Ligand binder design. Structure first.
Ligand SMILES: Nc1ccn([C@@H]2O[C@H](COP(=O)(O)OP(=O)(O)OP(=O)(O)O)[C@@H](O)[C@H]2O)c(=O)n1
Ligand SMILES: Nc1ccn([C@@H]2O[C@H](COP(=O)(O)OP(=O)(O)OP(=O)(O)O)[C@@H](O)[C@H]2O)c(=O)n1
Ligand SMILES: [Mg+2]
Ligand SMILES: [Mg+2]
Lengths: 132, 133
């Protein structure tokens, strides 16, 4: 039972518009380096725009990072029967309902990972560049 | 059919542990009200953790909210071949790399939707409460 399906979406099928974008992508070189390194960890959200084409609802920075890497596809969830109003609500939902993990929590986590012997070079790098 | 798959996962199939949790869930009242009204919009992330059981990697607040709705299940991505280190990385990924949308952006969106005649009462109320103190 599905209205949502996840696919490896060719970027040529994504409409070249940005109605649901909330903010400029900005510099995505750091996000792109992380995606080249680890893969794209979280799929973006799109809806059909007829014509075997799709409109981006969430994920502008991730898509911008994949274009920086000169990739031709993005992992995407396709939402069926997503109205204009419900796509607007979706585009805002992480912004409104996510609780950020503050730097105090990240520092305490780093210290605990160290006490546990779980601080790999790559995780140390990540946490310290975020805590800089 | 690759290395991740999405399921409606019974909550009783999560291990009773919190190895990858970063912070207390806190009051999930408002998140639960939103999920009751709109559905769970984004799936949580898990990995297999024994026979027919799973370990939560991302999504402790959504799981708490669903348990604060007395629901039987959570929408979940099951990650295969997710090592201990790669799960730690994934549990930190949104925290480190997600750029917040600040309230200045939310107010400017509220104002633009109004100016456009596109501001429904529902979205007005959502933006105004996010912009509440
Ligand atoms: N290797 C990585 C590193 C990060 N992420 C994800 O990239 C997202 C970046 O979040 P955000 O700053 O909100 O960017 P987008 O959602 O892509 O862009 P927008 O919010 O503007 O639509 C985070 O969810 C993070 O988990 C990812 O998919 N793969
Ligand atoms: N109706 C709603 C409203 C919110 N969300 C999601 O709930 C998540 C809340 O994020 P966060 O504060 O980080 O909580 P969790 O990820 O669930 O918990 P944790 O970060 O501690 O693992 C956001 O991604 C938001 O999009 C959702 O799925 N359905
Ligand atoms: Mg985002
Ligand atoms: Mg989270």
């Amino acid at each position: 039972s599905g209205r949502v399906t996840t696919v490896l979406l060719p970027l040529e099928k994504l409409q070249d518009e940005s109605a649901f974008k909330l903010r400029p992508e900005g510099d995505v070189s750091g996000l792109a380096t992380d995606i080249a390194r680890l893969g794209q960890l979280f799929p973006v959200d799109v809806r059909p725009a007829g014509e075997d084409r799709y409109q981006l609802v969430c994920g502008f920075r991730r898509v911008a990072a994949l274009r920086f890497l000169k990739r031709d596809a993005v992992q995407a969830r396709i939402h069926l029967r997503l109205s204009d109003e419900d796509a607007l609500v979706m585009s805002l939902a992480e912004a409104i309902h996510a609780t950020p993990v503050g730097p105090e929590v990240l520092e305490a986590k780093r210290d605990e990972l160290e006490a546990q012997g779980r601080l790999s070079a790559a995780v140390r790098d990540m946490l310290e560049k975020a805590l800089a």
